[PDB]
Amino acid sequence: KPEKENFEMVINFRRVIMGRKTTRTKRAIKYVRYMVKRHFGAEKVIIDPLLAKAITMNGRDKIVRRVRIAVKRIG
Amino acid sequence: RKLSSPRRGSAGLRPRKRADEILPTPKNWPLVNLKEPKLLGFIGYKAGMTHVYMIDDKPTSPNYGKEVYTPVTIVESPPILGLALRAYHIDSKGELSVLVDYWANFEEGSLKYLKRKITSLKVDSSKMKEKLDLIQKNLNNITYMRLLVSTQPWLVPSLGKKRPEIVEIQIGGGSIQDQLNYGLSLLGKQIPVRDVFREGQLTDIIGVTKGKGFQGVIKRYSVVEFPRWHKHRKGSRKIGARGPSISTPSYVPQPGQLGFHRRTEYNKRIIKIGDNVNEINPAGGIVNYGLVKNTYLVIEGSVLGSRKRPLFLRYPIRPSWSPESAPKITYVNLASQQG
Amino acid sequence: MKGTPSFGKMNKTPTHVRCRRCGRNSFNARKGYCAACGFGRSKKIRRYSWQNKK
Amino acid sequence: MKISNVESKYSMKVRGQELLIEEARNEKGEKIIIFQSLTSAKLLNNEEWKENTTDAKNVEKREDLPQDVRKITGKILSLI
RNA sequence: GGGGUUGAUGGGGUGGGGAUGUAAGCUCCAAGGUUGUAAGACCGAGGAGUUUAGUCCGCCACUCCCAAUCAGGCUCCCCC
RNA sequence: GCGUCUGAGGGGUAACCCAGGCUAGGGAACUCGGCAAAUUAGCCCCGUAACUUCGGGAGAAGGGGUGCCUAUCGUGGUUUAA
RNA sequence: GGUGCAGAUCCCGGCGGUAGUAACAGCGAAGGGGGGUGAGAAUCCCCCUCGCCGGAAGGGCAAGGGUUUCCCGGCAACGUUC
RNA sequence: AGCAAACUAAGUACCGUGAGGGAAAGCUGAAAAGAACCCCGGAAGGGGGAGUGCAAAGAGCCUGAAACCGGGUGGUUAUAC
């Protein structure tokens, strides 16, 4: 049985930046789906807007280098 | 009217293609030069570089007997673990193929490091006896005698790898019978660079240069930007014509891969073989490499290739001058490569 | 300009409109005449020896 | 570092939007805030999940929030 | 080219070494002024301490906390 | 009012092209040609040649000040208003 | 006897290759998350947020088109994708 | 081809501000007997199976060539026209 954790994880938005300015914010949240499956076996990723919102207090091209996340990954 | 101009780009190295084995190999060897059995090169790694202060040793130097400043490259020298002995002879058709090999790690070497990359021998038929005396039977009719050795990068955390390379080195010395016995001893043990080298020697470099990806002709062969107006008109980064006619669209600058090549280097004289890591380690961890924690080779000038590449070394093929040992130093830069 | 814009100004009224006689939108208001139905200066119907190729 | 257990949960009503707040400490024991504002979310296979809210207490005035919680909310509450 | 639980490959964390140039708030001073009987408290562009700070670092080491799994394919049994 | 000037997603993003930004040092040697590109530029005050059709030339030329704040003061308008 | 064809840069109809190639960039817009509908959703709908325009992409008015207006139901093409 | 015109409208759609120019397009068998009915898909004279009928080339319906492309039959290839 998968560990139904109430876990908190720290992400590093290193790889996403340094490439195309015009794409970051989308790749940002798309990157979010990457580790979440990898570190939690996620079948489908449901993100509240706010925890997604803070990545873009910026619109297009400015993004915080890291952020904290909490997951109630139900079945 | 068709002024003089050297042919630009370098026609000497066509074709320009990328090597097929990350660790190259020499194709010749400098003569033994009237001496006793020992090896003629070494393996290592490109860790980093700095600048050093020394008294000039060149007796004919214009800077003789003074402190001058010179960039210097560091080469961590992990111990080498030999594998086997290879027999080369004038075979049928008068060629120099491998007569036979001589492997032995069942007597010593319970190391799975080799196993990571080769599913090597089992103890079932470790009967090299009939192989070894074959050399003895084929004694006096042998020409060359190399050596199978492997690197031990697992003793270097800087390179995060655990399956090693096994490569070759030809050994010259006194009589042939001596050389085989000399090699026979070296099997199954560990060998420092000091077992082959000493300070103040010359050394040769064959390796793989810093890769760069597909390149532009401007960069590949240093072709010239068209003057002024083309910085505004129709295109700038290309050659105009591509030959007088289809009569050999020739060796002319055309795009392609640059870097990661098998290349050459001449006239490299070592500086120091130290053993205190604190004497050489710069500030804050050497850039992109880590913290050297084995014996290291202090080589001046520039050494081709990217950081974290194995490098195979060699005695001078056409040495310019015979060097004496120990060009003593006066300063080592521990300052951060950053900043 | 001689190219497309020459076609630009072409939204105004047709210089030939529905003449009441021949059902052809070919009444030149500007000339006070139809060049198709002949109404305007001929009592007779406009007809020619060369309505077609012979 | 893993979250051990939850102790704090309030309810706040901002810009015509529901809002929950969660507080808990990890096994390293550092107190870190948890923002979560949605009650419905499509289950995979294949239903709807209702976020439970029975035990949450209702906050209606700003300073009623714990002081440390309040003094960090400013950088975020602007862009709800 | 590496790594893949027999692990330091990438994130986290801690230190290491760097770039900018000293975070907010607090206090003190402030060219004058606002008051206020006075006492006092109030505004103020700014200076100082609070502080080689705070933010950040496609660099390094230590640390198994998280992640290298599940899965699919192709194929050899020639030799006894 | 719009996310319809109506195709989109991946990526450490090679060359190259078109749009740009910036380049030490020399500063027209490039070049048919300083083409391009650059430099100046708002405003107030001071100050302004030869020549001439006496009207200009003439923002000729050139020089100086320009922020923020704490105060002020003057002038004028305006409200039934010398 | 309109009479036997390979062409006449023949005519007409069908289909080749270059080939799933060019293009679907360039004139300063840009979306993201959650939910709904429906077989099918980057493209449609609901919510929130965000960016852009903002002497015009806003507002009101012609000649012209002639139902291009609105309601209801649909998607084979028609829409540069769906 | 036969006058442009044999067809749901032909001087018709349409190209032109205009005098004007000017198209394309036939065949289900005799009788629709147009596949009831059962399974897939949402649907499509779509699939499958059954049925009508001498015959289904059954709506895109007489016969049905090549240029074409696909499956297969028979040979046959990476030292070479």
From Swiss-Prot, chain A:
Molecular function as annotated in GO: structural constituent of ribosome
Q: So which domain of life are we looking at?
A: Archaea
Q: What keywords does the record list, in alphabetical order?
A: Ribonucleoprotein, Ribosomal protein
Q: List the disulfide bonds.
A: none
Task: Keyword check for Cytoplasm, yes or no.
Answer: no
Entry GO CC: ribonucleoprotein complex; ribosome
The entry sums up its family as follows:
Belongs to the eukaryotic ribosomal protein eL31 family.
Name of the protein in question:
Large ribosomal subunit protein eL31
Curated annotation (Swiss-Prot), chain B:
Q: One MF term from GO for this chain? A: rRNA binding
Segments carrying the region annotation (Disordered) are 1-19
Stretches assigned to coiled coil: none
The answer, when asked if Ribosomal protein is one of the entry's keywords, is: yes
* InterPro entries noted in UniProt: L3_arc_euk, Ribosomal_L3_dom_3_arc_sf, Ribosomal_uL3, Ribosomal_uL3_arc, Ribosomal_uL3_CS, Transl_B-barrel_sf
The record's Gene Ontology cellular component field reads:
cytosolic large ribosomal subunit
Q: Which UniProt keywords apply?
A: Ribonucleoprotein, Ribosomal protein, RNA-binding, rRNA-binding
Q: Name one Pfam family in it.
A: Ribosomal_L3
Q: Does the keyword rRNA-binding apply?
A: yes
Which one GO biological process term can you cite for this protein?
A: translation
Q: How does it assemble?
A: Part of the 50S ribosomal subunit. Forms a cluster with proteins L14 and L24e.
What is this protein's function per UniProt?
One of the primary rRNA binding proteins, it binds directly near the 3'-end of the 23S rRNA, where it nucleates assembly of the 50S subunit.
Q: Which family does it belong to?
A: Belongs to the universal ribosomal protein uL3 family.
What is the name of this protein?
Large ribosomal subunit protein uL3
Q: Which organism is it from?
A: Sulfolobus acidocaldarius (strain ATCC 33909 / DSM 639 / JCM 8929 / NBRC 15157 / NCIMB 11770)
Gene of this entry: rpl3
From Swiss-Prot, chain C:
Q: Name one GO biological process term.
A: translation
Q: Which domain of life is it from?
A: Archaea
ZnF C4-type: positions? 19-37
Gene3D superfamilies on file:
2.20.25.30
Question: Protein name, please?
Answer: Large ribosomal subunit protein eL37
What Gene Ontology molecular-function terms does this entry list? rRNA binding; structural constituent of ribosome; zinc ion binding
Species the sequence originates in: Sulfolobus acidocaldarius (strain ATCC 33909 / DSM 639 / JCM 8929 / NBRC 15157 / NCIMB 11770)
User: What is the required cofactor set for this protein?
Assistant: Zn(2+)
Which GO CC terms are listed, alphabetically? Answer: cytosolic large ribosomal subunit
Give the record's cofactor note, including how many are bound.
Binds 1 zinc ion per subunit.
The family this protein is said to belong to: Belongs to the eukaryotic ribosomal protein eL37 family.
Q: Which UniProt keywords apply?
A: Metal-binding, Ribonucleoprotein, Ribosomal protein, RNA-binding, rRNA-binding, Zinc, Zinc-finger
Q: What's its job?
A: Binds to the 23S rRNA.
Q: Which SUPFAM superfamilies match?
A: Zn-binding ribosomal proteins
Binding locations of Zn(2+): C19, C22, C34, C37
Sorted alphabetically, which InterPro entries does this protein's record hold? Ribosomal_eL37 (IPR001569), Ribosomal_eL37/eL43 (IPR011331), Ribosomal_eL37_CS (IPR018267), Ribosomal_zn-bd (IPR011332)
